[PDB]
Design a binder for these strands. Structure first.
Lengths: 93, 105, 650, 98, 81, 95, 106, 98, 86
DNA sequence: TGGAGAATCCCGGTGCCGAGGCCGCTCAATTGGTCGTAGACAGCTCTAGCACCGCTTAAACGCACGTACGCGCTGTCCCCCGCGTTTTAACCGCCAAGGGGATTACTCCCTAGTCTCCAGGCACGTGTCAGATATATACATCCTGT
DNA sequence: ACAGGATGTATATATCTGACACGTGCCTGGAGACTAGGGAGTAATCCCCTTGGCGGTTAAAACGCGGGGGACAGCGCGTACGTGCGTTTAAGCGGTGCTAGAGCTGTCTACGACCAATTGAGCGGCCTCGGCACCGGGATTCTCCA
């Protein structure tokens, strides 16, 4: 009976920018499907890169290469800054 | 016992991301910091479209962001519109795109 | 090999030796070496129930695994002992030929060496029952008389050639083993073995190989199997369709990684093949050595100069090298011998019977003569200074010592352990070694100011492109005053500051080279001025215009095909006396014995070729006063990287 | 009957349908439509009402992009009226049928 | 009374042209558009049926639909996928 | 020895199967190599996602049938599922 | 011992195919009839393209099939083109055409 | 000196180049252009001649579909002339840039 | 430090080259206002993939660029070309 | 108006050549047996949950006319566009030549699979309440005729 | 030629139903340690990639240039929005209902692991021959004259 989403993690980051505003549950599902799509897209892309360089392991360099291969330029620059924002902030903690 | 999310100081749960990486079966040997990179990127783009959605809802002056607002927030941009070009939207519609000869004489 | 007595040998391992040695011989962990604790075992079928158990709560048995492993270890041990017996018998044949020479073998089998000083017993010379022959070969040119150990070496090579085995000439690299190799091939020419021979050496080492094939043995008909794929294909149509009944050059991986060349040299069906500095032949787990053993040849020669380690894989490589019908033997169990990687829990070399086999295989197949047996005096006097190089030794104690280590730089994420690769960088370490060197390749005379004046009067010339006002300056401001002496003079458009009034006269290493010019001006000690850097080679081109005149800067490109063009114009008294090698070339063969005082203007921080590239110096009978000299400055990076720091005791 | 000019009602409806983003087609004929469509491949299949809602959504969204495309064709064709040759050209550019 | 390709009506086609932002239409648009949408949906509806068959279900969910639309490249957000 | 794998021998096989009197371009042979590469991976990337949708750990020929019934034109499928059943029956029944 | 191709009488490296199914990182386990099925349909598509290639080679009266035969093949069958609309052929060009306005003058 | 009717030589050349399959672009200026292009992102990189021939064929095959599409627009525009707005409509309806 | 530099060359696509492409594009009459603009059309096309291609090569940590790099580049938009090793 | 002729297409034979067939050779991968377990098949049950009835009703749909306005035709003109010429030039041939960079063993080693306890986030059930729908309602603004 | 009328449009009241916050099981990320094996990365080496460099020359730049479609207007016409009056059926609601996904258990078999061997093939090489240029030479052709 337990089924999965990201709607609370949608919800925090909704409240992390616009804490006042609400959102439709339809839109909640929309963002759930949206993050599912972009997650699966970038993961499939990076695993294809992993087969290309024949590297069975994967690192964050693969993910950075993946979003550079997927995103437009300002989006990709913002994304590589956002990814490199918290990697060793996680790791050295 | 500390989670990775607050350790990263972020709000996307990297552990279930790792879980659906592993059981999703894409790469052979899953790196530790790679989903930490990934969910961070996801959190950024989620908040990024959320901001323009909230801006559109503020232009409608209402609290609840609706799929109409999502269509506005994806149609006003071009690079996000580049990324979500083939994405059909539920209750989507499109922006008001009136052309020249569609005006009467 | 057997089964039952080997099983009893596994049993006496598992019932006799210590826990370190049980983990050695059986290849197990110390926990499995104990399970020593489960020792004794009445048989290996009692070890069949001795399986290391799974943990207790609060897939494979250890029996078959350890029995089979130590069984293959022991069968490899007895196969090793068969190789020990075979190499000891044929080294007894080697010493039989030595006693047939009536001559003192000054080394033994027990370290895997063979040494001789002189062929005096010169006084007794050649006995009639001997593979020794006193005279140099006639196809060897008589420009240089081959000396005592050299004639001993060519006759030892002739002996092991008659033995129809493979041999090692492992003298300490000053002895000129390529010289005696080529003299051996000239003796084969004089004994009508006139091909096919094969030489395999790196391309930078093909200097003294091909130049010695041109100089010391011109009557030896030599082919060169070197080039590109299509060039060596052309040589393959030259040699395959045998238009040339030649006598005797490719590299190791060129003859190893390309089957086409491997099958071509197999098609050639050689007689002698020589491997110089065979570190792959220092590796029985190197199949390059396997392919070099797959050359058809009744004699193989190995030319090394390092003393052999106490490594079983190294000595097994040398044994299967020197012994035919041993490389032909599969030696499959010798592979599982090698799989234990000398771990602290399982140190297979320090297994007792493997140490016994190290001493036991050691081995008269290794003609190894030290220099001190057959001695080139190594005069070590450090450089004397002018006050200008040490003036900027502190100036580049600031641009070398730019702030990079021993604080924390700002970054978006907490990345701290990835910034330890800036100091001792390549450009800054060669700039620190050029702090020791001649000091005007810095920004001290044309720093940044005089070169916009070079770009000023450069527009009125054909040497001006669409964008070269700033660009010839930006290509001239990074080059420095040594590099700006040899074109601001020569280009006749900018000559207001062309010569810097020769500040190289009052210089450190130039006046030390000028102290050693007394060996090149006043005496016939032809000097081999080594270096490291091609801009310091340009320095030694330009700084020999002051007291001893320069003839031509010796280019380091005599490696390609039998080149004499810069070495034929040599061996005069003073006007042709300063020729410029470096440590760039191979240290395998010698030139004429007239060039003796090899002088390192730029020293080498490694002890790899300073035993080798000074083989032009070490000799029993070189025809002049022979020294070697190194230019080390007293407190820069040069005295640090010089290997004279400390030692150890035992 | 006060006479309106043509297109004005169409213009305010264009503004309405660009503002309002709801469904258009009646659900019962579309449901019988997808039922008779599904009969071509296997008879007696059942469908979620949400599924046929998404069907109606995806279909409307597919045709309106073609509609804007053909509108731009007629703009290029100096016309405010459309003909099915514009649709043929649309499927030609997207490589659908023509 | 009807076959379901006539279940759509040309006032609804006209209103789709209003959301299509189209001012004037011919009398030829309607059946052409009907066939276009019909073959377009029929391309992926059979794929949804094959999904349910490989799911061994006689019922059609919505997941299969957007999976086929993803293989159609007509990707949707709003019902999970 | 510097080896790799192509499908040029199998392309030549099926070539001499259907038209023994016929040569080919090596360049067009490489086109065919890349072609069957694409043909393999397309159905592979299909069936993986199908097994994810069907919650499966394992992909059998029953998955491949529906996979090509998705990704292929219909008459190609109308020959292809027959050839697939025939080939798997020859594989399984015989030997 | 029959090869798995020859177990179905086929001309494909079904062992190597199934190995690529293993190392292809798609699923965990691989059913044994699946490489049979996919190699069979690769054989079907290969036969369908190469028969038309031989057809155009006979039309070109050529022994060695040029890539323009492949171009004409994928530009003749719809179902081939329906599969291969997104593909392009090196040194292939396009099928020839002259449009209705583009006729020469009467 | 015989002068033809204008365009007939272009029609026989359409026959010639729809007949032939070889490349069209001069390799060196195209190569220099794409080398400059890659240099703009990152300076002093290398490629293959095979790689640059692949780029040449990919570019030509990319352009000719746009050519045929715009030709169909000019057909619909009742024109044999091709205009910039035809290409703008092409990239518009395929949604590439316009 | 001595290196060369050469950009533009966008005119290296000559107008008669574009005309011959229109021949294989199969168009009879061409206005003068075309030869400038298609140079940009390929450009954004080329720059969509070329810096993407070295995005492989940077992760491939090479300095040359393979033809397979071009294959992986053109696969990203799905404009699949064959036979360059792929 | 049929001809006609330079332009153009088509064509047998010339003589390479260069890929293409074809044969060897060694190595790796496959084809074999057996475990083995766990997922998958299959059986069991059931319960939400599409179908599918019927009642009513609102509005969307359907036509009449209608006219007018938007598409079509044709006249003209013009200006831009193909089309042979020239020259010029840069590309290709092709040759050379060097070197940074691709290639492959090698060696750790650390970095990441994996097992179990838990606890703690974290999804499911359930009021809740307040936004936004839902409906009048009086005012701003713009269509359509002055 | 502003004004009359129709429609937007914030104003103001209802209600109600999605948002949400918490219980609350619950299960799973995290720890934490084993462990082992791909990755880093070293280092030394060939090689394809680059840069230059020179001659020959196809072809591009510039040009005439005449004429041909693009276009512009505009006359006509016909059909399509756009009313207003039937209409009808979609929808909304509700009640079976049955059935089929949607699970459960529960056994089992099929593929994954792991070694052998042998031969398929892969690479090198070698032979050789179909086609690919010319190459004159026969057969078409269609812009321009009878």
């Amino acid at each position: 009976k337990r089924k999965e989403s990201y709607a609370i993690y949608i919800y925090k980051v909704l409240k992390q920018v616009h804490p006042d505003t609400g959102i439709s549950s339809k839109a909640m599902s929309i963002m759930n499907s949206f993050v599912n799509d972009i997650f699966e897209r970038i993961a499939a892309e990076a695993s294809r890169l992993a087969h290309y360089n024949k590297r069975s392991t994967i690192t964050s360099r693969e993910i950075q290469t993946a979003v550079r291969l997927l995103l437009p330029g300002e989006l990709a620059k913002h994304a590589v800054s956002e990814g490199t924002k918290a990697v060793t902030k996680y790791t050295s903690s | 016992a500390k989670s990775r999310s607050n350790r990263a100081g972020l709000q996307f749960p990297v552990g279930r991301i790792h879980r659906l990486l592993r059981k999703g079966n894409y790469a052979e040997r899953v790196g530790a910091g790679a989903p930490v990179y990934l969910a961070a990127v996801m959190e950024y783009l989620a908040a990024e479209v959320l901001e323009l959605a909230g801006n559109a809802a503020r232009d409608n002056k209402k609290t609840r962001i609706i799929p109409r607002h999502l269509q506005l927030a994806i149609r006003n941009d071009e690079e996000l519109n580049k990324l979500l070009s083939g994405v059909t939207i539920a209750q989507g519609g499109v922006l008001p795109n009136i052309q020249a000869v569609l005006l009467p004489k | 090999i057997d089964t039952a007595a080997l099983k009893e040998e596994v049993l006496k391992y598992m019932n006799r030796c210590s826990t370190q040695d049980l983990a050695d011989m059986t290849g197990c962990t110390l926990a499995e070496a104990e399970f020593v604790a489960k020792r004794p075992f009445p048989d290996l079928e009692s070890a069949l129930v001795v399986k290391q158990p799974r943990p207790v709560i609060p897939k494979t048995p250890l029996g078959p695994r350890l029995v089979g492993i130590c069984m293959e270890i022991m069968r490899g041990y007895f196969v090793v002992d068969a190789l020990i017996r075979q190499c000891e018998q044929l080294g007894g044949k080697i010493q039989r030929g030595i006693e047939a020479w009536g001559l003192s073998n000054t080394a033994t089998s027990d370290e895997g060496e063979t040494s001789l000083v002189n062929f005096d017993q010169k006084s007794f010379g050649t006995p009639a029952n001997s593979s020794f022959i006193t005279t140099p070969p006639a196809s060897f040119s008589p420009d240089i008389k081959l000396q005592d150990y050299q004639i001993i070496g060519i006759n030892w090579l002739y002996l092991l050639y008659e033995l129809k085995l493979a041999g090692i000439l492992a003298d300490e690299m000053g002895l000129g083993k390529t010289c005696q190799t080529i003299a051996f091939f000239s003796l084969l020419m004089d004994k009508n073995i006139n091909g096919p021979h094969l030489v395999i050496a790196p391309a930078s080492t093909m200097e003294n190989w091909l130049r010695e094939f041109a100089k010391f043995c011109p009557k030896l008909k030599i082919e060169l199997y070197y080039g590109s794929q299509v060039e060596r294909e052309e040589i393959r149509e030259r040699i395959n369709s045998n238009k040339d009944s030649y006598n005797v050059l490719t590299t190791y991986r060129l003859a190893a990684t390309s089957k086409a060349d491997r099958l071509f040299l197999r098609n050639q069906k050689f007689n002698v093949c020589v491997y110089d500095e065979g570190h792959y032949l220092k590796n029985r787990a190197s199949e390059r050595y396997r392919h070099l053993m797959s050359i058809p040849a009744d004699f193989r020669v190995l030319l090394t100069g390092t003393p052999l380690q106490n490594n079983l894989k190294e000595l097994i490589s040398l044994l299967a090298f020197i012994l035919p019908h041993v490389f032909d033997y599969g030696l499959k169990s010798l592979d599982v011998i090698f799989t234990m990687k000398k771990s602290p829990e399982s140190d297979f070399e320090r297994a007792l019977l493997s140490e016994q086999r190290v001493s036991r295989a050691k081995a008269p197949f290794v003609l190894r003569r030290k220099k001190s047996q057959v001695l080139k005096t190594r005069i070590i006097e450090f450089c004397e200074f002018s006050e200008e190089e040490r003036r900027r030794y502190d100036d580049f104690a600031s641009k070398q010592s730019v702030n990079s280590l021993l604080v924390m730089k700002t970054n978006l994420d907490t990345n701290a352990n990835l910034a330890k690769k800036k100091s001792t960088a390549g450009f800054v370490l060669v700039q620190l070694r050029k702090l020791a060197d001649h000091p005007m390749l810095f920004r001290i005379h044309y720093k940044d100011d005089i070169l916009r004046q070079m770009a000023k009067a450069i527009m009125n010339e054909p040497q001006y492109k669409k964008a070269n006002e700033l660009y010839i300056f930006e290509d001239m401001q990074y080059m420095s005053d040594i590099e700006l002496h040899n074109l601001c003079c020569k280009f006749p458009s900018i000559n207001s500051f062309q010569l810097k009034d020769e500040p190289w006269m009052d210089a450190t290493k130039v006046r030390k080279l000028k102290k050693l010019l007394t060996n090149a001006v006043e005496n016939g000690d032809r000097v081999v001025l080594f270096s490291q850097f091609t801009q310091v080679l340009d320095i030694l081109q330009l700084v020999m215009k002051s007291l001893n005149l320069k003839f031509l800067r010796f280019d380091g490109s005599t490696q390609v095909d039998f080149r004499q063009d810069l070495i034929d114009q040599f061996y005069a008294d003073e006007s042709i006396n300063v020729f410029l090698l470096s440590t760039k070339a191979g240290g395998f063969g010698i030139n004429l014995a007239c060039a003796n005082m090899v002088i390192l203007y730029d020293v080498s921080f490694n002890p790899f070729d300073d035993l080798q590239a000074e083989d032009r110096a070490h000799r029993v009978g070189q025809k002049k006063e022979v020294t070697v000299y190194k230019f080390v400055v007293k407190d820069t990076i040069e005295e640090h990287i010089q290997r004279l720091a400390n030692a150890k005791i035992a | 009957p006060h006479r309106y000019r043509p297109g004005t009602v169409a213009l305010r409806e264009i503004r309405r349908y660009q503002k309002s983003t709801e469904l258009l087609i009646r659900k019962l004929p579309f449901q019988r439509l997808v039922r008779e469509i599904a009969q071509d491949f296997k008879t007696d299949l059942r469908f979620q009402s949400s599924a046929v809602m998404a069907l109606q959504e995806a279909s409307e969204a597919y045709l309106v992009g073609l509609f804007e495309d053909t509108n731009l064709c007629a703009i290029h064709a100096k016309r405010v009226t459309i003909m099915p040759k514009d649709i043929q050209l649309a499927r030609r550019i997207r490589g659908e049928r023509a | 009374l009807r076959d379901n390709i006539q279940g759509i009506t040309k006032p609804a086609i006209r209103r789709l042209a209003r959301r299509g932002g189209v001012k004037r239409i011919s009398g030829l648009i309607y059946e052409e558009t009907r066939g276009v949408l019909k073959v377009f949906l029929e391309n992926v509806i059979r794929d949804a049926v094959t999904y349910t068959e490989h799911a061994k279900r006689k019922t059609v969910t919505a997941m299969d639909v957007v999976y086929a639309l993803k293989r159609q490249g007509r990707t949707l957000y709003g019902f999970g996928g």
